[PDB]
Amino acid sequence: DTSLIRELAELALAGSGQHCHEEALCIAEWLERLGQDEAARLIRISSLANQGRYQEALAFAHGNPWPALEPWFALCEWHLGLGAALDRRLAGLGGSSDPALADFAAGMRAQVR
């Protein structure tokens, strides 16, 4: 148990991309009870974005404290056609010290802009 908490979080993430939204959500709520907020937030956002509920996923962007979640908000802005907001977010991520964030930003700008 911690090994199982991690596996349930992984099942929820995998499931959030394969239409298992109710299941993913139950797991995210439980992860929050356990204090695994960043992982719960990732699952919630992935599940909402993968259902096309972009505006609700974007409610979490306000004051977002976890930079690794920023790409999801750029993707939401992209599907909502919010071009200028997308461009500002990508420009911000461009200077990230996390290479994955910086590469995600440069790559999406390149594919999208």
Binding site: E7, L11, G15, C20, E23, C26, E29, R33
Partner: protein, 70 residues
Amino acid sequence: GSHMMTALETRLSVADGTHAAALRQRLQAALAECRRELARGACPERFQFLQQQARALEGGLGILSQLTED
């Protein structure tokens, strides 16, 4: 996705479903303990906690079934 969006899915794409069967058993075992404790009664705080835990476990079993179904 076409090729595994997550590490768990790669683990599960292995020939002998050894990992999937093992994970399913662990989830079922945890869900049965959870239901047994709920049946004994639990205070209200523990009850809401256990119910959320049971639903998380049932959700995990449901996702696992979908990830491994032929």
